[PDB]
Amino acid sequence: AFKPPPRPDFGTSGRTIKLQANFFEMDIPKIDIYHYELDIKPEKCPRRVNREIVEHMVQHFKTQIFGDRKPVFDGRKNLYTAMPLPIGRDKVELEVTLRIFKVSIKWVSCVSLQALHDALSGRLVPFETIQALDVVMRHLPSMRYTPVGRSFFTASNPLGGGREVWFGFHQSVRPSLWKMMLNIDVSATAFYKAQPVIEFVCEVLDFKSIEEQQKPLTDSQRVKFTKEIKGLKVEITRKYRVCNVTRRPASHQTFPLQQESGQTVECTVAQYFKDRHKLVLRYPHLPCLQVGQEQKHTYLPLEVCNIVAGQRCIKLTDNQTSTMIRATARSAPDRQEEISKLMRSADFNTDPYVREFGIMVKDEMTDVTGRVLQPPSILYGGRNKAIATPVQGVWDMRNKQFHTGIEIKVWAIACFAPQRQCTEVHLKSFTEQLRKISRDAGMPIQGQPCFCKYAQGADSVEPMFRHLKNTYAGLQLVVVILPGKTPVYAEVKRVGDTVLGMATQCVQMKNVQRTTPQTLSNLCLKINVKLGGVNNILLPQGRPPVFQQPVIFLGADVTHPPAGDGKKPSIAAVVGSMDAHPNRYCATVRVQQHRQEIIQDLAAMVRELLIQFYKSTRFKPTRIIFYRDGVSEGQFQQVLHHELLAIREACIKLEKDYQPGITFIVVQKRHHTRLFCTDKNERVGKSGNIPAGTTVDTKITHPTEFDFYLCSHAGIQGTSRPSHYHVLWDDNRFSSDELQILTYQLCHTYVRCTRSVSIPAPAYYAHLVAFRARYHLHQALAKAVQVHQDTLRTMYFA
RNA sequence: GGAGUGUUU
């Protein structure tokens, strides 16, 4: 439970394909870099100010300290030079005036670039050296741009609610098999528009003019406004940070003011701003922003506050994201060209600081040979046992029937939309069409619905659902019609998943009025699996040799609430395959610590899944294949330590000598690696992306460890994100080919569509399970996420 | 229905 295994070999399966990646080769000298620590006082200043402190410091003490050397600075404590500063072992205390700062500089260590080169050829990598290079490369942009994480942005594209989309770029230095790579990609994120809070109030509460609201805010408006502006920074027309919005208006909101006599008296914010600042508040009927430490009693009228510029958005409305998707999505060729322009304007080979450290960057994207793996055949059932062959990551069910289709004889309909909007003739036409498609799909819905009624309100779900279970023997499914985004869906799922063991399929009102065969087909995919059916399976004989013994595939993911909201738990989910196909999955879900990435109760969850596997297959797994999603590189050792041990603990707690081989694989979508076709003829579709199944385990991958990118999906729009897979542990001694082929085939087992998806089904299912828990809304939280015994064994999350 | 696409008061 310690160190990731070395790369066992290089893959050779699949037809070769010429690719380019947004990785640019770095030529780096074998010199020593000199690392100096900077403890400046005050020590809590923003990184920008720190950079300014250091900026003036270098120039101010050019004569006696720095000379002609051009140091780089990380914004905190670390400063690097290509040559040693004439300060030896001893610390030097300096003054910096901008307003006064006590800056101390002391040498710490020599960063050996020679030691890095050798790490890039076995000797299995020092984090410190890579970090230092990163500081060198991003020193100038950190002064020339607004740094946001590993990205850089400038002000130019609204989204609504005071939001704007800024265009910038991501930059990071990365290790590879022989050289350092510079990873560059275009970036885009939502920022709050810098504007007066009064106008923020308008755009949030949809006012064309603040004058429309001549009166104090309703309890509804204030709550909505509080939600948006909380945690955001503001400035005086001095920078503050909003922690709440007052219930009372500025004309009546008071605070204790100490008069010069010594006695303290309550004074209104409005009266204070009149006496102290000679300002008659224009909108004294509006509330104040509570900034500071709550205990500060610091209230600011809205009309004297502006949203500070450069604030990144941390949940977007569905209209905002749609607009954001629209403006940010662009074809792979177009994105590739944008990155080229990015490199051109960056002009690294003239950057004074990277020239100081003798660094050079290649202007062309790295050439990589990819491999297009062969897709698996998909076996269907019914009369003619049709075999589907994925083409460009896609297949269909035409002249095919489910492997094991569920005969639906008893089923009901509930409609939570107006009877005028979704009339009886809609239901009749919808039902008739649904039966025909289901008939052709091998999931024959025999006969009309045994029940059909109208309703409205989330309070109607349960008692209606209370009825149906008792009155109709063998009730299989209850179709639910919903009028757009109505917070009743969450209640349909609560009752259907938790209180009663009842399968429920929701469908929007619009998809009932106007039905299409394709929509109905996809609806049948979800229904069949929800009732325990098997839509299809991998062609058994086309499976990798891992299936020669009983094996269980696990998918794990944890979803976090908005940072800083607090008091909201993270949701961990683990799913496990329950047959040899593999098709059916059982789910486990837990609430845990806010923003905790480690799955706390993993041992218990894995135990439950092993038990169910044995009950379903009468076999104990000889191998556990664990696909872990939602983990960054900086967390690998922490996650691997706790979670590999937890998996082991589950096995031991089950039976003393039970030691199946564990393969631990982290799957990552959140990265800035992009692959492009070198040959135009290899571009797929209008988006011109790489084909489904393209694999790369060379050139841009880890120099010693077992990792690969796999674009398992076809790109519909924008530029495809190839998934990255990093093997943190492997008792089973997979070859490169078998593991890559295995991952790829698992991307074809996802039951909600006849498409190869971007991550293996179990990892995807884990996401769905965790997301379903969000709709389920400390012991109560754990109870509210707990699923019915009936539902416990089903795929309700589909 | 679905996948993919952007994240001092």
Q: CB atoms < 10 A from the CB of A216, how many?
A: 17
Give buried/exposed letters for A723-747 (b at 16+ CB in 10 A, else e): bbbbbbbbebebbbbbbbbbbbbbb
Instruction: Give the H or E element holding residue A51.
Output: helix A47-60
- Closest nucleotide relative to residue A714's CA, C1' based: B4
Q: Measure the CA–CA gap between A192 and A580, rounded to whole angstroms.
A: 50
Distance measured from the CA of protein residue A517 to the C1' of nucleotide B2, in angstroms: 13
In chain A, which residues from 717 to 736 place their CB closer than 7 Å to nucleic acid strand B? 717-721
Distance measured from the CA of protein residue A45 to the C1' of nucleotide B9, in angstroms: 23
A402 and A536 Cβ atoms separated by less than 8 Å: yes
- Taking the CA atoms of chain A, what radius of gyration do you get in angstroms? 30
- Closest nucleotide relative to residue A712's CA, C1' based: B4
Instruction: Report which residue is nearest nucleotide B9 when distances run from CA to C1'.
Output: A298
User: Could you report how far apart the first and last alpha carbons of chain A are, in Å?
Assistant: 34
Please choose, from the candidates A547, A607, A586, the residue with its C-alpha nearest in 3D space to the C-alpha of residue A746. A547
Superfamily of chain region A542-798: Ribonuclease H-like superfamily/Ribonuclease H (3.30.420.10)
Q: Measure the CA–CA gap between A424 and A441, rounded to whole angstroms.
A: 25
Cite the DSSP H helix spans in A314-423: 318-328, 332-346, 352-356
Distance measured from the CA of protein residue A468 to the C1' of nucleotide B6, in angstroms: 43
In chain A, which residues from 231 to 260 place their CB closer than 7 Å to nucleic acid strand B? 236, 255-258
- Closest nucleotide relative to residue A718's CA, C1' based: B5
In chain A, which residues from 295 to 334 place their CB closer than 7 Å to nucleic acid strand B? 296-300, 316, 321, 324-325, 328-329
Q: Measure the CA–CA gap between A628 and A668, rounded to whole angstroms.
A: 9
- Closest nucleotide relative to residue A298's CA, C1' based: B9
In chain A, which residues from 595 to 654 place their CB closer than 7 Å to nucleic acid strand B? none
- Closest nucleotide relative to residue A322's CA, C1' based: B6
Q: What angle do CA A163, A168, A170 make, to 5 degrees?
A: 125
Is A522 strand, coil or helix? Answer: helix
Instruction: Report which residue is nearest nucleotide B6 when distances run from CA to C1'.
Output: A325
Q: Measure the CA–CA gap between A525 and A391, rounded to whole angstroms.
A: 20
Distance measured from the CA of protein residue A721 to the C1' of nucleotide B3, in angstroms: 14
Distance measured from the CA of protein residue A727 to the C1' of nucleotide B1, in angstroms: 35
Q: A627 pairs with which residues across the strands?
A: A555, A665
Q: What single letter denotes the amino acid at residue A213?
A: Q
Is A540 strand, coil or helix? Answer: helix
Please choose, from the candidates A732, A728, A729, the residue with its C-alpha nearest in 3D space to the C-alpha of residue A661. A732
- Resolution of the determined structure in angstroms stands at 2.2
Whether A334 has a binding-site annotation, put simply, is no
Sequence-ordered list of residues with C-beta below 8 angstroms from that of A334, at least 6 positions apart, any chain: none
- Closest nucleotide relative to residue A290's CA, C1' based: B9
Sequence-ordered list of residues with C-beta below 8 angstroms from that of A657, at least 6 positions apart, any chain: none
Q: Measure the CA–CA gap between A203 and A186, rounded to whole angstroms.
A: 29
Is A46 strand, coil or helix? Answer: coil
A243 and A292 Cβ atoms separated by less than 8 Å: yes
DSSP string over A444-482: -B-SS-SEEEE--SGGGHHHHHHHHHHHSTT--EEEEEE
Going by the DSSP 8-state scheme, the letter that residue A754 receives in this structure is S
Is A368 strand, coil or helix? Answer: strand
Tracing tokens 């790579």 back to the chain, one arrives at: A181
**What is the side-by-side order of every strand in the sheet holding A15-21?**
A585-592, A570-577, A551-559, A623-629, A661-668, A723-730, A707-711, A694-696, A366-372, A15-21, A675-677
- Closest nucleotide relative to residue A687's CA, C1' based: B5
A609 and A560 Cβ atoms separated by less than 8 Å: no
Residues of each domain in chain A carrying CATH 3.40.50.2300: 372-541
Q: Measure the CA–CA gap between A589 and A315, rounded to whole angstroms.
A: 23
Query: Beta strands of A28-175 (E only): which ranges?
Result: 32-41, 72-73, 78-81, 92-97, 100-112, 146-148, 151-153, 163-175
Distance measured from the CA of protein residue A119 to the C1' of nucleotide B2, in angstroms: 46
Q: Measure the CA–CA gap between A398 and A339, rounded to whole angstroms.
A: 41
Residue A550's alpha-carbon distances to A524, A619, A733, in angstroms, are 30, 7, 16
Distance measured from the CA of protein residue A107 to the C1' of nucleotide B5, in angstroms: 47
- Residue A276: CB less than 7 A from any atom in strand B: yes
Backbone angles phi, psi at A667, to 5 degrees: -110, 135
Q: Measure the CA–CA gap between A493 and A769, rounded to whole angstroms.
A: 12
Cite the DSSP H helix spans in A150-235: 197-205, 219-229
A364 and A181 Cβ atoms separated by less than 8 Å: no
Distance measured from the CA of protein residue A297 to the C1' of nucleotide B8, in angstroms: 10
Count how many Cα atoms sit within 13 Å of the Cα of residue A119 in the half-sphere of its side chain: 18
Q: What angle do CA A23, A27, A28 make, to 5 degrees?
A: 120
Q: Measure the CA–CA gap between A692 and A459, rounded to whole angstroms.
A: 46
Residues of each domain in chain A carrying CATH 3.30.420.10: 542-798
Q: Measure the CA–CA gap between A317 and A296, rounded to whole angstroms.
A: 33
- Residue A184: CB less than 7 A from any atom in strand B: no
* H helix count then E strand count, chain A: 21, 36
Give buried/exposed letters for A150-160 (b at 16+ CB in 10 A, else e): ebbbeeeeebe
In chain A, which residues from 468 to 527 place their CB closer than 7 Å to nucleic acid strand B? 506-508, 511, 518-519, 522-523, 525-526
Please choose, from the candidates A686, A673, A718, A757, the residue with its C-alpha nearest in 3D space to the C-alpha of residue A325. A718
- Residue A189: CB less than 7 A from any atom in strand B: yes
- Closest nucleotide relative to residue A151's CA, C1' based: B7
Instruction: Report which residue is nearest nucleotide B7 when distances run from CA to C1'.
Output: A189
Distance measured from the CA of protein residue A408 to the C1' of nucleotide B1, in angstroms: 19
Distance measured from the CA of protein residue A523 to the C1' of nucleotide B2, in angstroms: 8
Q: Measure the CA–CA gap between A192 and A310, rounded to whole angstroms.
A: 7
Whether A767 has a binding-site annotation, put simply, is yes
Distance measured from the CA of protein residue A382 to the C1' of nucleotide B7, in angstroms: 43
Please choose, from the candidates A102, A103, A126, A106, the residue with its C-alpha nearest in 3D space to the C-alpha of residue A116. A126
Q: Would you call A344 exposed, middle or buried from its count of C-beta atoms within 10 A (0-12, 13-18, 19+)?
A: exposed
Could you say which of 3.40.980.10, 3.30.70.330, 3.40.50.2300, 3.20.20.70 is the CATH number of the domain covering A372-541? Answer: 3.40.50.2300
Q: Measure the CA–CA gap between A709 and A22, rounded to whole angstroms.
A: 13
Q: Measure the CA–CA gap between A719 and A722, rounded to whole angstroms.
A: 9
Q: Measure the CA–CA gap between A628 and A633, rounded to whole angstroms.
A: 12
- Closest nucleotide relative to residue A719's CA, C1' based: B5
Distance measured from the CA of protein residue A371 to the C1' of nucleotide B6, in angstroms: 28
Instruction: Report which residue is nearest nucleotide B8 when distances run from CA to C1'.
Output: A298
A36 and A107 Cβ atoms separated by less than 8 Å: yes
Torsion sign over Cα A122, A124, A129, A131: positive
Going by the DSSP 8-state scheme, the letter that residue A391 receives in this structure is B
- Closest nucleotide relative to residue A315's CA, C1' based: B7
Chain B nucleotides near the protein (CB, 7 A): 1-9
Whether A557 has a binding-site annotation, put simply, is yes
Residue A684's alpha-carbon distances to A522, A680, A750, in angstroms, are 24, 9, 22
Quick one: tokens of A654?
């089950």
Please choose, from the candidates A513, A590, A497, the residue with its C-alpha nearest in 3D space to the C-alpha of residue A794. A497
A597 and A641 Cβ atoms separated by less than 8 Å: no
A718 and A336 Cβ atoms separated by less than 8 Å: no
Q: Looking at chain A, how many residues does it have? A: 798
Query: Beta strands of A525-633 (E only): which ranges?
Result: 537-538, 551-559, 570-577, 585-592, 623-629
Distance measured from the CA of protein residue A326 to the C1' of nucleotide B6, in angstroms: 8
Count how many Cα atoms sit within 13 Å of the Cα of residue A798 in the half-sphere of its side chain: 32
- Closest nucleotide relative to residue A756's CA, C1' based: B3
In chain A, which residues from 523 to 562 place their CB closer than 7 Å to nucleic acid strand B? 523, 525-526
**What is the side-by-side order of every strand in the sheet holding A378-379?**
A387-388, A378-379, A537-538
Please choose, from the candidates A583, A428, A418, A435, the residue with its C-alpha nearest in 3D space to the C-alpha of residue A486. A418
Cite the DSSP H helix spans in A347-450: 352-356, 424-440
Distance measured from the CA of protein residue A426 to the C1' of nucleotide B2, in angstroms: 22
Q: CB atoms < 10 A from the CB of A775, how many?
A: 14
Q: Measure the CA–CA gap between A793 and A798, rounded to whole angstroms.
A: 13
Q: Measure the CA–CA gap between A232 and A312, rounded to whole angstroms.
A: 10
A711 and A740 Cβ atoms separated by less than 8 Å: no
Distance measured from the CA of protein residue A778 to the C1' of nucleotide B9, in angstroms: 37
Could you say which of 3.40.50.9100, 2.170.260.10, 3.20.20.70, 3.40.50.300 is the CATH number of the domain covering A193-312? Answer: 2.170.260.10
Give buried/exposed letters for A425-456 (b at 16+ CB in 10 A, else e): ebbeebbebbbebbebbbbbbeeebbbbebbe
Q: What single letter denotes the amino acid at residue A15?
A: R
Quick one: tokens of A117?
């080169």
Q: CB atoms < 10 A from the CB of A411, how many?
A: 25
Distance measured from the CA of protein residue A233 to the C1' of nucleotide B2, in angstroms: 40
Q: Measure the CA–CA gap between A158 and A326, rounded to whole angstroms.
A: 12
Residues of each domain in chain A carrying CATH 2.170.260.10: 193-312
Q: What angle do CA A712, A714, A717 make, to 5 degrees?
A: 135
Count how many Cα atoms sit within 13 Å of the Cα of residue A439 in the half-sphere of its side chain: 9
- Closest nucleotide relative to residue A716's CA, C1' based: B4
Tell me whether the omega of the peptide bond preceding residue A42 falls within 30 degrees of 0, making it cis: yes
- Closest nucleotide relative to residue A510's CA, C1' based: B1
A370 and A19 Cβ atoms separated by less than 8 Å: yes
Q: Measure the CA–CA gap between A400 and A387, rounded to whole angstroms.
A: 8
- Can you give A699-710 as a three-state secondary structure string? CCCCCCECEEEE
Q: Measure the CA–CA gap between A392 and A755, rounded to whole angstroms.
A: 9
Q: CB atoms < 10 A from the CB of A587, how many?
A: 28
Tracing tokens 């325990």 back to the chain, one arrives at: A532
- Residue A423: CB less than 7 A from any atom in strand B: no
A433 and A395 Cβ atoms separated by less than 8 Å: no
Instruction: Give the H or E element holding residue A131.
Output: helix A127-137
Q: A378 pairs with which residues across the strands?
A: A388, A538
Technique used by the depositors: X-ray
